[PDB]
Structure formats: structure tokens, C-alpha cells
């Protein structure tokens, strides 16, 4: 994530500031920083603003500009042409970009919105079923990082302190059984509830950096403001409120609603098991630890060796602490290359088959097949352009293209209206 933080200016900048001291008349310039601070922590020439950007955020800007292509665009300094393409594909997968690369109205909302496009999707979809406070609390948590101090780093694994560690960790799981960042969410506003004086006592029981904790309160107060500015036509008039900062438990239905808004945030950063897509290709059994269970990203390309595509779950991840058969489709914030034997995965939550299709529907990554014929699979056709039909949806790479490796979803009733010769899904029937 990109954030605006007070940081040392360039030396050349500092010289310009001293310059104005003299232009009207020769005078001394004072500097609060010491000279040997100045030599160390300053850059002689300010590093270009363009480099300071997220590249995807640059791509979003030109799309507001309506520029046809970045490679077409003339620039002083190059971002990688391929990396620029990945952002375009990423925006398409998020849904900001149509297959014609023209910026969608959902996309145009983001060029207005400051933060990066991926974090923007969560916030455009956040305002659903009064779940807006939760997503911002999630997003603020994601930006700050992991507050949990793992038992291995603590060195407690003393044994009683493991039990206290486990109990705080059991306390964390109550909001969602299989979800780590919903669980991380469960801590963000849990500390909002506990009083100010008992914060330092709350953190020590939970081993949380209270300095890290308090930021999510400020970020939440900020992020909530920017979102409320954008949602409401009276952008400035909206005010941040402590009561709105306070929020209630997401209902059990809302928990699934949270799962979808996360998947909207990270549509690409998703992985199915290895075995589900290739049953019997690699031996899998319950006795194997959840770390030993392999997963494959859809965005990951098909590889000569399956194990390279295989990615595994983090032991610090909660799902391994459960010790149950994992859920079939997993969603991850990031894949940690650490571990030669196994690539680590931290997962926000389990993502279900049918709900995943909806985010896939929102994105351009999804591919539809032709209608299938079978008992009860007949299709109604009101007008030449529209039918209701059962279509097997294939996420990411199709069966035809072997370059990438996607999983196929089960067929579902859907309404399709012809547009330019193929019939656009109007709603999941």
C-alpha cells in the first residue's frame, strides 16, 4: 500500500529553501536537522514522483485521461512495459477495465479515489448490508500489517504462556472459524471496545503492539472519511463519528458478505488446492499437516513441474492450528516465497465456490461455456437475444488454453442477453 508520510526532503530541495532566504537579501538559513543528519538521510536529487507511485495507480490515472495505451503514451521515464500490462490485466480482473481496455464506471470511481485500485474495490463494494465499518477496519488492518507476535518469535515454545497465547488466539477465532483477517478484524474493534485505561492490559494479554494497535484507529477514522466523502454527494459535509467507528458483530450472513468483499479486493490473489484441480496427482491425506497441503493460484501459469505451482499454507496461519480438512477454495493476501520445500500462504478467509463466481462475474477473469444439454438443463428464450440457461463457468484459464492453470466451477442457472454476438450474464438465476 502507498501512504503519505513525513519524510526527509532531498538535499537539492533543502538548498532551494535556503535559496529564498538570500534572494531578497543575504541572510543565514537555519536548519533544525543537524548537518550530519543532512548528509545521511537526504537524497541529493529528489527521486521522481512517478517512481513513488504504484504502477497500477499510474495506469488508473491514464485511464481517467482516456489515453488509449501507456505504451502508446510518450513518457520521460519507463515503467516496465510488461508490468504495465499486468496492471491492465489486473484492472480487468478487478473489473476496472473492460475487455476493450476502456475504463468502466466502477473504474472511473477509482481514479477519483486516491488509494490503490485493489484497496479501492473493497471500498466500492464495502457499502453493503451495513458492513462498511467492517471492511475499512479490515483494510486498515491489512495496511498496518500483522499485530500478532507469533509464539515462535516470543520463544515461549513458558508452556503456560503458550496456553495464555493459545487462549488469546482462541479468543481471536470466535468471529470466523476459518478466516485469519476476519479474525484480525476481530481484534481491531475488540480493542476499540475495551476502555482506554485497560488497553495496555489488553495488549499484554494478547501480546499486541499497542503502538501498532492505535494506528488502525486513526486509519479507520481516516479511511471512513475518504469513503464517506466519495459515497455522498456532499463529500466534505460528511463527518467522522466515534459511534460509527463503533460497530456491531457482522451477522453470520454478513460474514459471507465479508468473504465476497475481500475476494473483490483480491480476485487474482486466490488459490485452489492442487489436488482438487488434479486429483491423485499428489498424495493428500488428513494426517498431513495443513502446511503439507498444496495449493495452486489460478493466475499462476501452468508449469512443467506441478510442485512449482504448488503453494502451501503458513504454520502461523490459523487454519493449520485448527487441524481439520481445509476448505476447498482458499484466498490469500500474499504468497511468501520463504520455505524452499513449500511456499507459504496467509489466507484472509475461505472463499466458497458459488460466491467466488460472483466476484469472478464482476471481474473479467471469468469465462463462460456454451449451454449444456441434459435432463433439467433446457434453456428458456424469451427474445432472440436473451435466454436463461445453466452454464458451467470456468475461472481464469479455460480448458482450451494450457498456458495458465484455472479451476472450473460447477454450473449455475444464469440469465444471458446477446451483446455483439454472445449473451451477457445479467444475473445469477
Amino acid at each position: 500500500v502507498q501512504s503519505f508520510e513525513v519524510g526527509w526532503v532531498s538535499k537539492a530541495s533543502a538548498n532551494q529553501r535556503s535559496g529564498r532566504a538570500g534572494r531578497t537579501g543575504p541572510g543565514h538559513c537555519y536548519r533544525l536537522y543537524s548537518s550530519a543528519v543532512f548528509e545521511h538521510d537526504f537524497e541529493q536529487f529528489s527521486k521522481p514522483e512517478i517512481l513513488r507511485m504504484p504502477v497500477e495507480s499510474i495506469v488508473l490515472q491514464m485511464k481517467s485521461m482516456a489515453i488509449h495505451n501507456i505504451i502508446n503514451f510518450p513518457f520521460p521515464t519507463p515503467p516496465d512495459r510488461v508490468a504495465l500490462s499486468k496492471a491492465i490485466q489486473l484492472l480487468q480482473y478487478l473489473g476496472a477495465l473492460d475487455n476493450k481496455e476502456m475504463i468502466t464506471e466502477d473504474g472511473k470511481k477509482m481514479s477519483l479515489f486516491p488509494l490503490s485500485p485493489r484497496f479501492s474495490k473493497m471500498l466500492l463494494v464495502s457499502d453493503e448490508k451495513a458492513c462498511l465499518p467492517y471492511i475499512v477496519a479490515i483494510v486498515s488492518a491489512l495496511s498496518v500489517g500483522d499485530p500478532f507476535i507469533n509464539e515462535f518469535e516470543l520463544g515461549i515454545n513458558k508452556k503456560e504462556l503458550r496456553s495464555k497465547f493459545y487462549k488469546s488466539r482462541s479468543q481471536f477465532s470466535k468471529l470466523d472459524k476459518f478466516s485469519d483477517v476476519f479474525r484480525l478484524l476481530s481484534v481491531v474493534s475488540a480493542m476499540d471496545y475495551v476502555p482506554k485505561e485497560q488497553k495496555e492490559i489488553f495488549m499484554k494479554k494478547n501480546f499486541l503492539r499497542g503502538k501498532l494497535m492505535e494506528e488502525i484507529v486513526k486509519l479507520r477514522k481516516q479511511l471512513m472519511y475518504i469513503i464517506k466523502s466519495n459515497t455522498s454527494k456532499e463529500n466534505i459535509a460528511v463527518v467522522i463519528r466515534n459511534e460509527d467507528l463503533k460497530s456491531d458483530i457482522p451477522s453470520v450472513i454478513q460474514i459471507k458478505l465479508l468473504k465476497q468483499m475481500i475476494c473483490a479486493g483480491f480476485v487474482d490473489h486466490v488459490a485452489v488446492r492442487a489436488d482438487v484441480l488434479f486429483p491423485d496427482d499428489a498424495k493428500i491425506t488428513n494426517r498431513t499437516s495443513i502446511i503439507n497441503i498444496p495449493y495452486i493460484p489460478v493466475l499462476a501459469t501452468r508449469t512443467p513441474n506441478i510442485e512449482d505451482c504448488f503453494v502451501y499454507i503458513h504454520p502461523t496461519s490459523i487454519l493449520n492450528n485448527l487441524g481439520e480438512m481445509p476448505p476447498k477454495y482458499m484466498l490469500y493476501y500474499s504468497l511468501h516465497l520463504g520455505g524452499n520445500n513449500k511456499t507459504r500462504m496467509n489466507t484472509l478467509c475461505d472463499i466458497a465456490s458459488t460466491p467466488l463466481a460472483n466476484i469472478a462475474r464482476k471481474g473479467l477473469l471469468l469465462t463462460y461455456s456454451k449451454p449444456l444439454t441434459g435432463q433439467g438443463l433446457k434453456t428458456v428464450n424469451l427474445s432472440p437475444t436473451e435466454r436463461y440457461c445453466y452454464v458451467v463457468p470456468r475461472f481464469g484459464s479455460t480448458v482450451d488454453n494450457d498456458l495458465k492453470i484455472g479451476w472450473d466451477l460447477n454450473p449455475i442457472a444464469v440469465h444471458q442477453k446477446k451483446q455483439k454476438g454472445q449473451w451477457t450474464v445479467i444475473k445469477f438465476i
Binding site: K174, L175, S186, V187, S189, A190, Y193, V194
Partner: peptide, 4 residues
């Protein structure tokens, strides 16, 4: 509270 429920979140504690």
C-alpha cells in the same frame, strides 16, 4: 463484549 462479543469481540473480547
Amino acid at each position: 463484549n462479543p469481540w473480547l
